[PDB]
DNA sequence: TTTTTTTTTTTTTTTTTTTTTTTTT
DNA sequence: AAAAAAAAAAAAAAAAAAAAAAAAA
């Protein structure tokens, strides 16, 4: 029975242990979700009770956890839900006892390291924590946020192993209510104060401190963002990395603080923190994170066959492209590029080659006048993918974009903290107003775009943080308008080296077309008075990341070589963006990305042709000329 | 000399037998109903308006204002004694602390009164008490009930402050209670339970947060109004400790009148000071018939009432009016704010209009040039908390930026995000957030695609000389200096207090663009596209039309925009662009 | 009661970052 | 007129030297 540090009326309450126990057992034995959707619950025989199947899964795998959805209790029994939310300390042990009794009644010969402990989650979301009140103290709450930082493991004692200094008699005292009762008298030889505590022979659990930024959906006027402190105990340590977006369900704890870390006097004001009970990484408004892809049992066989059938349609690429940001009108090439960025290229291992890491992400630079719908795409992608980040040029600095050092104002220790770029390690960094960026902070992006690492060497520590980010940059033409009198490269106003890093530079220009203006006006007005669903695109991308690992073929290789030679000839002009060897690599990624859309698992002529076509359409190479302009 | 049992009797008499006819000539025993509501746990704060007390007992009010904490405690205890005889039914156990209270009472060296109140009381300063300037609140007014006006510069976050600590013993099962008055307290280590005292046990008792009593707590610093600072001095700031139902009432930048108690916190016996808030009121712009509103010309009247002393500029004021009203946000997320930049030659009353909007808009900030730059606009990290700048304080308001052209280049870049993204993405060394600034920017500058492409309206003002036009203006201005009031006209201009209500009344009127006007708007938009092409108009211009058209729809308070608004919205575009030419 | 170790506070300096300013194309 | 490099501001962290108070025996 692993003790959980997270945790007739008992006292001043409305709960009797037997009543809660029986009610929870009943709920566990006869609960069926009526509107349960087969896809929403994968690998679960819907007709039969859900949580009994959960217990069967526990028996099979052995994970001694039961993710119980608080909404299920809410629907089945609101009084039990009230008891649980109001008194998590008392209710959760009762639920643990109930589930253990149920799971040892059936399957009486199962073997587990410890008993099974329930983890309520999806409690009624607290939109903004600031709205929390002292009346909401020591109660279960669910919030949503982004993890700024996670601290190293802290070992917390649970059993003190004492030994007599004289006779060496060993006894194990157990934590009572946050304190350990030192024997003060040996039981063996009866010598007084001969029992000394022994640290390394004692028993310890884990405790991890996580500083988390909340994204409250209720944002009153003038309210600044809010960061809070979470504690993860004995299994949830390092279940969330910095940058992860989580829904944290836990007990709202308020604890005393000593005016000094040494004197016993405490301020009248407490300070609150959450003891994590459950992490939920799933969100219906975003794609699947890397962890969700990692676990195999996420796609029901029917859903897998549905995705396979989708991949066989000729318009799979165009259907997927049309799905991104439906409120943005006829940006087909740009949406295709963003799709290829979301799919990403093959992650290859080049350690044996002695070459170092190879960038498999895709960086897209949208160069266009401020009027054009540039920032909308960046914000949408930032509000679409997980582990995404956003920046606005002059609002950032190099150190803040890479890493810094600060005194943690809860342990008073100088620790290193990550930057915006690192937080999006396996996500996307949307750099808006890229042009309005001082060269100092711009210089950093070179390594993050080529090596995918960030080698800091500062007094604090010398080390290289791995950042596999994909950069989605947006830039304005010099003079804030794409005057057709100046050449392309001159108009972009960025160093050639940097533009070489980007594998897709989309020029968003305003063609003075009456039909386009009329259609766009229709679209915008319709929007002002108002497909392929999210649930299918999200699953398609997750599956493609999980399984598809495209490998180049002979014809694809030959086509790539010829395309690179043609690019070198074409871009050899004066004003056009010159083509470098680094561009060939870009094509590969793009090709692979397209090969990943079709679930081909092998790049062939069509994929390379599509990559070349998309690259040429970008930069408007067809609409350009040797006399660039 | 000063008994308190008689005072308890007097306050009980006042509470039981005071009445008013507020609700349509109905004597209703003002405070009896409040007591009944308190006993039913449907109301947590009992504001004892001292004006009521003075109506029938001037000496009691004099004593109360001459000594605050004593009479606050007396009123609290009197309400406690009166609660039992006014309760009419059984409460439904609103919160957990009520359940604990009932269990303690049923199981019943006494329960401290503060542990079983669950009801707060606060004094509203008597009208005869003139509000006092912060600078003049000195030793002579320590413990008195004073009212002071100021600007909330910085308010801390709501935190639970413990009033009565509750411990449980490991042996006797009895509860130990400790009232808290000092900012810090010594936790009790041994239980004084009479059973353990008799038994002579260890009595090591553990603090329980389940039974303890917590109250909302917030700390704020409020400044002095610029109108009351001495000539050669700077505004003075005073600390206010709000608690209970006085939290989450005031945000930074809110003009607030606070009536509390000037009490010192013990550290000769030098002692700091603060105000224990009792009544917080939001004043002026922060403050919280129909026949004229239904008029056809009501749209013109508000416009003509914006800075009447500023002659002419009929069209500009009509455009600023829309900025105050703002468009309507649509989330298919497109902002509903309107950004107007007044560019012109020197001395064309650009700043005066910018200053006037500040004194009118509910939430506003007026930053001039490089006086408040950098972190002045955006936020900064100041435990380390985050403090917002003018934009954040102006969030969901109107940030009046003067001399936008001469602004720091970084600040201009920050604004670019705000007027399109309505956020402030910071990734500095110590700061990594994404603020929320849904503020309408009102920029003033002097003579630009880098700026034209962004603002929906770029009004250009030129005071080109003219014999008769200047003469009219001189008559207007010289009149203002002669009577201090704008020249009389056919209609009396609306007061700012009245205007704020009207504009606010129009905000919660989200209208809709009918399909019928789509062809008209599309037809109008395409023409606007060609004029710039023939002679800048992008997709932004169509949005500017829609936002402006909705703004007019709110003014007429029609939930459906009509073709007249589009014409009027375009007409403003015509003049705005024609101002450039 | 008398010591002792801590607690503070009161100055001062030092280091990183940011911002502001100066010089050059 | 705008970008690049330098200088200064300013804020946070560290040393530390000394005087006073709380806990221990
Ligand atoms: N149209 C006008 N009507 C009335 N007063 C005006 C007008 N234009 C300028 N003024 C006067 O000029 C003075 C300075 O104006 P100011 O707002 O500084 O001009 P700007 O800011 O446009 O340079 C103000 O006191 C104002 O009374
Ligand atoms: Mg001016
Ligand atoms: Zn022994
Ligand atoms: Zn006891």
mmCIF file of C-alpha atoms in Angstrom, chain B residues 173-284:
data_model
loop_
_atom_site.group_PDB
_atom_site.id
_atom_site.type_symbol
_atom_site.label_atom_id
_atom_site.label_comp_id
_atom_site.label_asym_id
_atom_site.label_seq_id
_atom_site.Cartn_x
_atom_site.Cartn_y
_atom_site.Cartn_z
ATOM 1 C CA UNK B 173 -10.067 15.135 20.553
ATOM 2 C CA UNK B 174 -10.850 18.718 21.585
ATOM 3 C CA UNK B 175 -10.239 21.719 19.338
ATOM 4 C CA UNK B 176 -7.973 24.654 20.180
ATOM 5 C CA UNK B 177 -8.817 28.064 18.718
ATOM 6 C CA UNK B 178 -6.513 31.074 18.374
ATOM 7 C CA UNK B 179 -7.724 34.486 17.160
ATOM 8 C CA UNK B 180 -5.216 36.316 14.969
ATOM 9 C CA UNK B 181 -4.588 40.062 15.110
ATOM 10 C CA UNK B 182 -0.829 40.385 14.663
ATOM 11 C CA UNK B 183 0.451 39.822 11.107
ATOM 12 C CA UNK B 184 2.315 36.794 12.494
ATOM 13 C CA UNK B 185 1.339 34.361 15.236
ATOM 14 C CA UNK B 186 3.042 31.697 17.335
ATOM 15 C CA UNK B 187 1.428 28.308 16.603
ATOM 16 C CA UNK B 188 0.329 26.453 19.718
ATOM 17 C CA UNK B 189 2.392 23.330 20.372
ATOM 18 C CA UNK B 190 0.640 21.803 23.397
ATOM 19 C CA UNK B 191 -3.115 21.454 23.710
ATOM 20 C CA UNK B 192 -4.747 23.369 26.593
ATOM 21 C CA UNK B 193 -7.723 21.013 26.483
ATOM 22 C CA UNK B 194 -8.999 20.547 30.020
ATOM 23 C CA UNK B 195 -9.032 16.758 29.598
ATOM 24 C CA UNK B 196 -5.336 16.559 28.712
ATOM 25 C CA UNK B 197 -4.556 19.162 31.376
ATOM 26 C CA UNK B 198 -6.176 16.825 33.904
ATOM 27 C CA UNK B 199 -4.480 13.794 32.333
ATOM 28 C CA UNK B 200 -1.096 15.555 31.996
ATOM 29 C CA UNK B 201 -0.457 14.233 28.490
ATOM 30 C CA UNK B 202 1.919 15.384 25.783
ATOM 31 C CA UNK B 203 -0.874 17.440 24.259
ATOM 32 C CA UNK B 204 1.039 17.899 21.009
ATOM 33 C CA UNK B 205 -1.734 19.248 18.776
ATOM 34 C CA UNK B 206 -1.637 19.701 15.006
ATOM 35 C CA UNK B 207 -2.986 22.696 13.108
ATOM 36 C CA UNK B 208 -6.003 21.848 10.940
ATOM 37 C CA UNK B 209 -6.906 24.006 7.957
ATOM 38 C CA UNK B 210 -10.298 22.274 7.760
ATOM 39 C CA UNK B 211 -11.580 24.012 10.887
ATOM 40 C CA UNK B 212 -9.538 27.197 10.721
ATOM 41 C CA UNK B 213 -11.107 30.395 9.392
ATOM 42 C CA UNK B 214 -9.802 32.102 6.253
ATOM 43 C CA UNK B 215 -10.740 35.490 4.803
ATOM 44 C CA UNK B 216 -9.941 37.083 1.458
ATOM 45 C CA UNK B 217 -6.969 39.448 1.682
ATOM 46 C CA UNK B 218 -5.537 41.980 -0.769
ATOM 47 C CA UNK B 219 -2.963 44.768 -0.453
ATOM 48 C CA UNK B 220 -3.016 47.856 -2.670
ATOM 49 C CA UNK B 221 -1.128 51.135 -2.982
ATOM 50 C CA UNK B 222 -3.225 54.165 -3.936
ATOM 51 C CA UNK B 223 -1.786 57.516 -5.023
ATOM 52 C CA UNK B 224 -3.053 61.089 -4.877
ATOM 53 C CA UNK B 225 -4.942 62.736 -7.713
ATOM 54 C CA UNK B 226 -2.715 65.115 -9.658
ATOM 55 C CA UNK B 227 -5.190 67.897 -8.822
ATOM 56 C CA UNK B 228 -4.437 67.707 -5.072
ATOM 57 C CA UNK B 229 -0.646 67.237 -4.920
ATOM 58 C CA UNK B 230 1.168 70.318 -3.556
ATOM 59 C CA UNK B 231 2.735 72.592 -6.143
ATOM 60 C CA UNK B 232 6.325 71.460 -5.617
ATOM 61 C CA UNK B 233 5.692 67.887 -4.463
ATOM 62 C CA UNK B 234 4.939 64.478 -5.974
ATOM 63 C CA UNK B 235 1.795 62.389 -5.350
ATOM 64 C CA UNK B 236 1.858 60.429 -2.105
ATOM 65 C CA UNK B 237 0.896 56.758 -1.883
ATOM 66 C CA UNK B 238 -0.911 54.999 0.963
ATOM 67 C CA UNK B 239 -1.431 51.306 1.657
ATOM 68 C CA UNK B 240 -4.889 49.734 1.878
ATOM 69 C CA UNK B 241 -5.558 46.206 3.159
ATOM 70 C CA UNK B 242 -8.882 45.054 1.738
ATOM 71 C CA UNK B 243 -10.439 41.867 3.066
ATOM 72 C CA UNK B 244 -13.608 39.822 2.904
ATOM 73 C CA UNK B 245 -16.144 41.186 0.432
ATOM 74 C CA UNK B 246 -13.899 44.186 -0.333
ATOM 75 C CA UNK B 247 -11.560 42.149 -2.563
ATOM 76 C CA UNK B 248 -11.620 42.028 -6.364
ATOM 77 C CA UNK B 249 -13.431 45.384 -6.476
ATOM 78 C CA UNK B 250 -10.534 47.608 -7.573
ATOM 79 C CA UNK B 251 -7.989 47.043 -10.346
ATOM 80 C CA UNK B 252 -4.820 49.056 -11.039
ATOM 81 C CA UNK B 253 -5.524 52.501 -12.445
ATOM 82 C CA UNK B 254 -9.033 52.683 -10.974
ATOM 83 C CA UNK B 255 -9.966 56.012 -9.395
ATOM 84 C CA UNK B 256 -11.325 54.923 -6.012
ATOM 85 C CA UNK B 257 -12.726 56.599 -2.921
ATOM 86 C CA UNK B 258 -12.054 54.314 0.051
ATOM 87 C CA UNK B 259 -13.491 54.745 3.543
ATOM 88 C CA UNK B 260 -11.580 52.680 6.083
ATOM 89 C CA UNK B 261 -9.638 52.896 9.348
ATOM 90 C CA UNK B 262 -6.171 54.434 9.590
ATOM 91 C CA UNK B 263 -4.456 51.861 11.803
ATOM 92 C CA UNK B 264 -0.755 51.268 12.528
ATOM 93 C CA UNK B 265 1.025 47.925 12.339
ATOM 94 C CA UNK B 266 3.429 47.533 15.241
ATOM 95 C CA UNK B 267 7.075 47.136 14.254
ATOM 96 C CA UNK B 268 10.390 54.786 20.470
ATOM 97 C CA UNK B 269 7.357 52.751 19.397
ATOM 98 C CA UNK B 270 7.519 53.905 15.799
ATOM 99 C CA UNK B 271 4.771 52.281 13.745
ATOM 100 C CA UNK B 272 3.904 52.131 10.061
ATOM 101 C CA UNK B 273 0.355 52.811 8.881
ATOM 102 C CA UNK B 274 -2.289 51.607 6.446
ATOM 103 C CA UNK B 275 -6.002 51.819 5.709
ATOM 104 C CA UNK B 276 -8.236 48.907 6.683
ATOM 105 C CA UNK B 277 -10.754 49.168 3.868
ATOM 106 C CA UNK B 278 -14.448 49.244 4.740
ATOM 107 C CA UNK B 279 -16.150 50.803 1.695
ATOM 108 C CA UNK B 280 -14.630 51.018 -1.797
ATOM 109 C CA UNK B 281 -16.320 53.111 -4.492
ATOM 110 C CA UNK B 282 -15.145 53.592 -8.078
ATOM 111 C CA UNK B 283 -15.330 57.258 -9.085
ATOM 112 C CA UNK B 284 -15.276 59.342 -12.265
#
